[PDB]
RNA sequence: UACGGUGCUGAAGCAACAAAUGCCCUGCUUCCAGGAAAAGCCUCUAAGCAUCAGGUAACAUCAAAUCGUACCCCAAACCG
RNA sequence: CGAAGGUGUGCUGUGAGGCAUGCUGGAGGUAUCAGAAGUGCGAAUGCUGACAUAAGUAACGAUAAAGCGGGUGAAAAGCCCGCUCGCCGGAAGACCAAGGGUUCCUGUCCAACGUUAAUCGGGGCAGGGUGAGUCGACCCCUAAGGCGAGGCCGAAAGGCGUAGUCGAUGGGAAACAGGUUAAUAUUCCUGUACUUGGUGUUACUGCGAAGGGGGGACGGAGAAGGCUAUGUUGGCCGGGCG
RNA sequence: UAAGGUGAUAUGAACCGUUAUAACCGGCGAUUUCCGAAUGGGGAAACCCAGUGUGUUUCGACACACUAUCAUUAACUGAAUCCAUAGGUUAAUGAGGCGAACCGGGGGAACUGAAACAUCUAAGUACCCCGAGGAAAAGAAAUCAACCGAGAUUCCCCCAGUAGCGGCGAGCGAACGGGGAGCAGCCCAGAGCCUGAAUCAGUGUGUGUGUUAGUGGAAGCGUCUGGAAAGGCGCGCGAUACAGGGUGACAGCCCCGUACACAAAAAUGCACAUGCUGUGAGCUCGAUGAGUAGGGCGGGACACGUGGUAUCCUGUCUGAAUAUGGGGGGACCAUCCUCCAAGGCUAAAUACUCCUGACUGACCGAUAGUGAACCAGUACCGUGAGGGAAAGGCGAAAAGAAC
């Protein structure tokens, strides 16, 4: 069957990437939460 | 060498830095092969380049 | 004019290999491990100055680092750059 | 923004209370209107989005005093 | 400000060699010394083709705590604790007994 | 000949027929549902420049950097 | 001269319990009288870990299919070489994009992985391997759309949007054949080409745009005609005479 | 400060050093790639592409600096449109982003409870947004009181679960007054007279006191058991040091320390003193914050749900007097008392702990305690936001088992 994850790095980075998070206010709050929790990989972006 | 190098000109320190960098190249290719059997010379050279760059920023612009 | 200090920091090591020995004895081409940010003109100037030898052409490629496991902890080696430096005919090098 | 430039009036929030005292949040907007005021010294018109209270203030104090207050406040006109 | 140093002659206070003497060969950063000829262990040394070792039961010296040794006072023939004083503006060692400067 | 290979040499190398969903064809015919944009490219002059700049024509010389390039890709290497 | 803890035994109390001691263990334990409680577990389709059971049972993943000799090796139904057999063949062959990211090649190992064994492997370990002016990206250009100086609007955050600037899936310069590596090749080599920019001379002399125009530049279906790829036969050459 | 070193797993190699530029610690410095507010333009973060200028060139080209936006100011320029203005450009200064809690403000729930539920509650709570400081806010009476008087603000204990509010239900819940912590008052709405006089800010200097490396630092032997003594048994000694930790079993006297005594080239905090710059001090005579108070309508805050409801705020419409005046004293009037709104500033007591140092615990002791004693916000899962583990101990010493 066709499963729900059909990967594409361009769409992955445009949707969940660093500059897509840094563009908006709420996306910057996402990066602030992951730094406070201490995530190693802060975003998707390679 | 900070006392020796302090008694030098800017062009003399630049000449020594270029002779150090040539020695650092010849050591790096020598240790690239298995020829170099004195590994401490790479460290001695890297410190002496840092001392020359320090004294150059002291004598010029300071 | 490319500066001599950069020309001294461009070249890292010669690369020993069966392919390097073949290209050295057949095509008169040496294989060098170079700095990663080094370009072809910097390599041609470095070999033409530090070895005083005539370079015909330089081909470059980037070597991707392997992923190794020391014990059970994962790790990754560094990406490094490789240069095929074709010397002109008659030129010789140790 | 529904803000009087002269008085600094602003939409405040309150409640609609029904007969059964059912409270729903509403807003109280100022009666803002854009009006061209003739400045006699500079001999020109200045458009101000001003409430009718502010128009009574301009009719009482004069437009030169108010535009002095708006420059001391740091407000464009 | 170390009391027991390298070329010092010490006596052993505790352990399987309570009373023996020897010279310190090197001091370790962990608060241990290697005293020449005292704390002997027999290591089963494995042969290596490189390094040319045949491999046997090598008897060699193990480290010991600095607390377990004291500097031997060769005058009195005993152990003395070590104090520090300034002579000529220079920090020297001396024996707590007889106030004699360690040399 | 390490039987894996490596070296040397090397004939003929034409014609007919059939023939594509590929090419001419971004064509031609026809229909209505009436079928992207911009740059490169060509050209026109504006201010400006006046015999300098620039233009094309030939020739010489120099440069063309950087990154990817292994391998699977229908699959035991992708999503399951 | 052996603590706690563990494991037995003996004794004792109405009971919760208590005491002594053997073995293990190898360093802490604690009377009494008071004090404070994370103070007592068999159940909560309780939570976590370990071990059973069914049970050495079901199954070992397309009914495309295997047989033999020799080799290696501790050992071969499965590996290698060989001869036969069978299967796909508009694919179960070959080349890529997306995606993965060293799975590529060589040597070595067989613990784990592999639904069996394994000397084998996309497994472990070490080393090696990806070569471009012409391929592609980058780059020039824009679509849908996004962002958006100013601006307009909005309690605030912010929303929309002008000039602009991004944005391919589309437009835009140029390389082919042969050979070669264990592994790369339109990238290396041999041969033969091509394009766009430069500087520099020489001849000639209207050059100039963010502007104007042209071009780029565009649909569906259908009909033939002309070709080629390619194939067949003949000829030709080499070998053969079962 | 030093006789030992070149961080760890993790040896080894090659070396350095031993009386002082070995190492180590601290102060001030130097360098400080790329991304990221990211700021030269773009961008799918750690990448792509420039422009201008000044320099070098072995003409191939190299190196360095600068170039974001907005606000404010100044200069120049500059439309329709004459002047002008908008606009443009240069230049200078500043901001931007991050961050635990506390704080002020703008918005603002519902589950729930009421044994249902709609007024009410939960609760101005959670949450979102904005701004600030080391604290913030508030603050020097148009206040209370009661005919006696008090004398800014904030905080604690009472008053008091009282008075009240309230489908008078559920529930919400003061104040006056009293005891305390802490205390500090001032200025402009304006002229003069005397003129720099108090105070504050900044910047120097000097002294003291800290902080950021450090130094000295007492006093035990014998014997028995035992693998090992710090234990047992004797005999001594120190203590302004018997806090604590380590050392082969439990050490005041083995070690590190502790009590105590000191110590800083350099940086820096805090006090004073004073220098300089700026600042004005005091006296006299005045002035006394208008679309404001108040009112009507609709809401909100006050313990007070419109009620007989004072007081405060304002979205809307209005609208005074002004020291011979006005506000309040819980509907309202009269008398009396008290105060002077429509301009501001102000320390302390108060709140909190991302972080640092010291110490403590009838706090845990590896299914506990942080999710994490261990390379844990990791492995792993998820497109993503996000979720989120398991896993400690040889021995005194590797002497980690030659053969
Ligand atoms: Mg390349
Ligand atoms: Mg409500
Ligand atoms: Mg000891
Ligand atoms: Mg390929
Ligand atoms: Mg295939
Ligand atoms: Mg026992
Ligand atoms: Mg027991
Ligand atoms: Mg027992
Ligand atoms: Mg216990
Ligand atoms: Mg319990
Ligand atoms: Mg039960
Ligand atoms: Mg249970
Ligand atoms: Mg079974
Ligand atoms: Mg059965
Ligand atoms: Mg059966
Ligand atoms: Mg079966
Ligand atoms: Mg099968
Ligand atoms: Mg067989
Ligand atoms: Mg088989
Ligand atoms: Mg076969
Ligand atoms: Mg078949
Ligand atoms: Mg078929
Ligand atoms: Mg691998
Ligand atoms: Mg393979
Ligand atoms: Mg086996
Ligand atoms: Mg197996
Ligand atoms: Mg493998
Ligand atoms: Mg392009
Ligand atoms: Mg573009
Ligand atoms: Mg657009
Ligand atoms: Mg804007
Ligand atoms: Mg927009
Ligand atoms: Mg494309
Ligand atoms: Mg291949
Ligand atoms: Mg055009
Ligand atoms: Mg069409
Ligand atoms: Mg043909
Ligand atoms: Mg026959
Ligand atoms: Mg180290
Ligand atoms: Mg930039
Ligand atoms: Mg940018
Ligand atoms: Mg409710
Ligand atoms: Mg409800
Ligand atoms: Mg209820
Ligand atoms: Mg304040
Ligand atoms: Mg009175
Ligand atoms: Mg000391
Ligand atoms: Mg001491
Ligand atoms: Mg013990
Ligand atoms: Mg007043
Ligand atoms: Mg009012
Ligand atoms: Mg009223
Ligand atoms: Mg109201
Ligand atoms: Mg009114
Ligand atoms: Mg009033
Ligand atoms: Mg009354
Ligand atoms: Mg006031
Ligand atoms: Mg345990
Ligand atoms: Mg835990």
d(CA C35, CA C62): 10
* B33 with C14: Cβ contact below 8 A: yes
Nearest to C8 among B21, B32, B33 (CB): B21
Q: Name residue D51's beta-bridge partners.
A: D32
Experimental method: cryo-EM
* C12 with B24: Cβ contact below 8 A: no
CB C93 within 8 A of CB C30: yes
CB D54 within 8 A of CB D6: yes
CB E69 within 8 A of CB E11: yes
Residue C65 DSSP label = P
Q: What H or E segment, with its residue span, contains residue B5?
A: helix B2-6
* B32 with C13: Cβ contact below 8 A: yes
What is the third-level CATH fold of D1-77? Ribosomal Protein L24e; Chain: T; (2.30.170)
Asked if residue B57 keeps its beta carbon closer than 7 A to nucleic acid strand H, the reply is: yes
d(CA C52, CA C47): 7
For testing the chain C interface, which of B23, B28, B32 should be mutated: the one with the most C CBs within 10 Å? B32
Per the listing, tokens 């010279």 go with E23
Query: 3-state secondary structure string, D12-76?
Result: EEEEEECCCCCEEEEEECCCEEEEEEEECCCCEEEEEEEEHHHHHHHHHHCHHHHHHHHHHHCCC
CB atoms within 10 A of CB E42: 10
Q: Is A6 left (phi over 0), alpha (psi -120 to 50) or beta?
A: beta
Q: Name residue E24's beta-bridge partners.
A: E35
Residues in chain E: 103
Q: In chain A, what are the domain boundaries?
A: 1-46
Q: In chain D, what are the domain boundaries?
A: 1-77
CB atoms within 10 A of CB C84: 18
For testing the chain C interface, which of B28, B36, B42 should be mutated: the one with the most C CBs within 10 Å? B28
Residue C83 CB contacts under 8 Å (≥ 6 apart), including other chains: C31, C32, C33, C34, C38, C40, C43, C58, C59, C60
d(CA A27, CA C8): 46
Q: What is the CA radius of gyration of chain C?
A: 15
**Closest-CA distance of chain B to residue C74, Å:** 27
- Whose C1' is closest to the CA of C82: which nucleotide? G131
For D5, counting Cβ atoms within 10 Å of its Cβ (0-12 exposed, 13-18 middle, 19+ buried), the class is: buried
Q: Name residue C1's beta-bridge partners.
A: none
Binding residues for strand G (Cβ < 7 Å): A 7-10, 23-25; C 15, 17-20, 23, 27, 29, 31, 57, 59-61, 63-64, 66-69, 82, 84, 86; D 1-3, 10-11, 27, 29, 49
Half-sphere exposure of E87 (CA within 13 A, CB side): 10
φ and ψ of E85, to 5 deg: -140, 165
Residue C66 CB contacts under 8 Å (≥ 6 apart), including other chains: C76, C77
* Residue from E15, E7, E19 nearest E62 by CA: E15
CB atoms within 10 A of CB B52: 20
d(CA A45, CA A42): 8
CATH architecture of A1-46: Orthogonal Bundle (1.10)
What distance in angstroms lies between residue D57's CA and the mean position of ligand 51's atoms? 17
Q: Would you state the structure tokens that stand for residue C26, as one six-digit string?
A: 């057949």
* Residue from C3, C65, C53, C9 nearest C28 by CA: C53
Residue E94 CB contacts under 8 Å (≥ 6 apart), including other chains: E82, E83, E84, E85, E100, E101, E102
* B25 with C5: Cβ contact below 8 A: no
**Closest-CA distance of chain C to residue B28, Å:** 7
d(CA B60, CA C14): 37
d(CA E72, CA E75): 9
Report long-range pairs for E23-26 (Cβ below 8 Å, ≥24 apart): E25/E61
Q: Would you state the structure tokens that stand for residue C62, as one six-digit string?
A: 């980037």
Residue E68 DSSP label = G
Per the listing, tokens 């406040």 go with D73
d(CA C47, CA C53): 7
**Torsion of Cα atoms, E85 then E91 then E93 then E94, to 10°:** -30
Chain B contact present for C2, CB below 8 A: no
* Residue from E55, E19, E53 nearest E38 by CA: E19
Q: Would you state the structure tokens that stand for residue C91, as one six-digit string?
A: 């030129």
CA distances from E46 to C59, E50, E60 (A): 50, 12, 14
d(CA D58, CA B25): 82
Half-sphere exposure of C24 (CA within 13 A, CB side): 15
* C5 with B21: Cβ contact below 8 A: yes
What distance in angstroms lies between residue B39's CA and the mean position of ligand 21's atoms? 68
Per the listing, tokens 């995530």 go with A39
């Amino acid at each position: 069957m066709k499963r729900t994850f059909q990967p594409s790095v361009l769409k992955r980075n445009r949707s969940h990437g660093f500059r897509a998070r840094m563009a908006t206010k709420n996306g910057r709050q996402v990066l602030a939460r992951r730094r406070a929790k201490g995530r190693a990989r802060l975003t998707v972006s390679k | 060498k900070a006392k020796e190098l302090r008694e030098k000109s800017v062009e003399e320190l630049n000449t020594e830095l270029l002779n150090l960098l040539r020695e650092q190249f010849n050591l790096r290719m020598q240790a690239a092969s298995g020829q170099l059997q004195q590994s401490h010379l790479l460290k001695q050279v890297r410190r002496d380049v840092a001392r020359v760059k320090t004294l150059l920023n002291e004598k010029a612009g300071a | 004019m490319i500066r001599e200090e950069r020309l001294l920091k461009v070249l890292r090591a010669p690369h020993v290999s069966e392919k390097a020995s073949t290209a050295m004895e057949k095509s008169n081409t040496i294989v060098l491990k170079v700095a990663k940010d080094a370009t072809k003109a910097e390599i041609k100037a470095a070999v033409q100055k530090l070895f005083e030898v005539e370079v015909e052409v330089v081909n470059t490629l980037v070597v991707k680092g392997k992923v190794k496991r020391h014990g059970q902890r994962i790790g990754r080696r560094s990406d490094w750059k490789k240069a095929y430096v074709t010397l002109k005919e008659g030129q010789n090098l140790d | 923004s529904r803000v009087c430039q002269v008085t600094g009036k602003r939409p405040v929030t309150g409640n609609n209370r029904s007969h059964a005292l059912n409270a729903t949040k509403r807003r109280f907007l100022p009666n803002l209107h854009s009006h061209r005021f003739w400045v006699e010294s500079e001999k020109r018109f200045v458009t101000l989005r001003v409430s009718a209270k502010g128009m009574r203030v301009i009719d009482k104090k004069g437009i030169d005093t108010v535009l002095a207050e708006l420059r001391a406040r740091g407000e464009k006109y | 400000a170390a009391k027991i140093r390298r070329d010092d002659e010490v006596i052993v206070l505790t352990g399987k060699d309570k009373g023996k003497r020897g010279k310190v060969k090197n001091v370790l950063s962990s608060g241990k010394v290697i005293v020449e000829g005292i704390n002997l262990v027999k290591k089963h040394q494995k042969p290596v083709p490189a390094l040319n070792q045949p491999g046997g039961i090598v008897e060699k010296e193990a480290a010991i705590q600095v607390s377990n040794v004291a500097i031997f006072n060769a005058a009195t023939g005993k152990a003395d604790r070590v104090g520090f004083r300034f002579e000529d503006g220079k920090k020297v060692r001396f024996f707590k007994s007889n106030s004699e400067t360690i040399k």
